[PDB]
Amino acid sequence: GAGVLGNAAAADPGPPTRPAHNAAGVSPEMVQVPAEAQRIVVLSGDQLDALCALGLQSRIVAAALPNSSSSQPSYLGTTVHDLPGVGTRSAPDLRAIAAAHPDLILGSQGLTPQLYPQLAAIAPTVFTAAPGADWENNLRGVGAATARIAAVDALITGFAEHATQVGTKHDATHFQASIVQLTANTMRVYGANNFPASVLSAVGVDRPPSQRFTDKAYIEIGTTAADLAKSPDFSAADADIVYLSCASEAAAERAAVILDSDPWRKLSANRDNRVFVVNDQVWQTGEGMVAARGIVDDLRWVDAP
């Protein structure tokens, strides 16, 4: 009974190559990149999102797949969905990366730090920080890596204004929103330090007191049959509105079990029909500007009847 919601930039003036910064802890920290990279290999989901927000998706030649997955993300359109794979984000395939003969490689120090020297020997390589709450800084690093700092500045400025405008029109500050993600065996309740939390903050939506922690991304509650038969407490998940995504198909197949469970039916948001199923790629795994706009779109339901 839970409603389902789901959810080319011109280069800066300069020479044909530019210096760009790697994330802190990458050696070396500076890398010379082309001003107009024609064949980009992207190894992290947030950078793929960034290239789409910059209108550069037709220059991507391959992308690392989400781990345990067998396909590219679909929330970014068919051109990205059809991209060849180069292994997964946690284990990129260097032979396939070399086979794409890229002139630019984007990756993340939070995913494959050990791989940077081998990647840099194939093509100019830029590593951003780990994806998550700092997505806007990661976007800024993609902007420098593609010589599109001005373009990224406008995307960030336009997003902040757009998010604030949506929050004002829909009275976001008067609602506490909960962020929940189901896995096959557990329920994850996200706090205030992660990708979707930072987008809810940009819109101005409040969070329930149980979801304001910042020491970790989420807390995890068991949801197996043995767990449910031990009278668990899901009250950390309650709010005025609950946004719930499923981390996998097996999680989706068990979602209705948890939503029908006695511990979940105790939640006031469930009684009030204010639990909404949302796209996990938009809310959890994309972690970029296009995903962020999808979350803002879903947040338009905070003041719905």
Author numbering: 42 to 48, 60 to 357
Quote the original article:
Mtb FecB and FecB2 are predicted periplasmic binding proteins implicated in host iron acquisition; however, their precise roles are not well understood. In vitro ligand binding experiments for FecB and FecB2 were performed with heme and bacterial siderophores from Mtb and other species, revealing that both FecB and FecB2 bind heme, while only FecB binds the Mtb sideophore ferric-carboxymycobactin (Fe-cMB). Mtb FecB and FecB2 are both members of the type III PBP family. Each protein structure is composed of N- and C-terminal lobes consisting of mixed α/β structures with a central β-sheet surrounded by α-helices, with the two lobes linked by a rigid “backbone” helix (α6), forming the characteristic fold of the type III PBP family.
The structure of FecB was solved to 2.0 Å in space group C2, and the asymmetric unit contains two FecB molecules (chain A, 42–356 and chain B, residues 45–357, where numbering is for the unprocessed FecB form). Notably, FecB has an extra N-terminal sequence that associates with the C-terminal lobe but has an unstructured connection between the N- and C-terminal lobes (dashed black line). The substrate binding pocket of FecB is quite different from that of FecB2 in contributing residues, shape, and electrostatic charges. The FecB binding pocket has three tyrosine, four asparagine, three glutamine and two arginine residues along with a glutamate and aspartate residue, Figs 2A and 3. The binding cleft of FecB2 contains three arginine and two glutamine residues along with one glutamate, aspartate and tyrosine residue to provide polar contacts with a bound ligand; and three tryptophan and three phenylalanine residues. The resulting FecB pocket is narrower and deeper than the FecB2 ligand-binding pocket, with one side pinched together creating an almost triangular chasm, Fig 2. In contrast, the back of the FecB pocket is negatively charged. Indeed, this charged environment trapped a polyethylene glycol molecule from the crystallographic condition. Mtb FecB has highest structural similarity to ferric-siderophore binding proteins such as Bacillus cereus YfiY (2.5 Å rmsd), Staphylococcus aureus SirA (3.1 Å rmsd) and HtsA (3.6 Å rmsd). Out of the ten variants tested (R141S, L163R, Q233S, R240S, Y242S, Y270S, E272S, D322S, Q336S, and E339S), there was only one variant, E339S, that had a considerably reduced affinity to Fe-cMB. Ultimately, the affinity of the E339S variant was so diminished that it was unmeasurable due to the solubility limits of Fe-cMB. This acidic residue, Glu339, is situated at the back of the FecB ligand binding pocket.
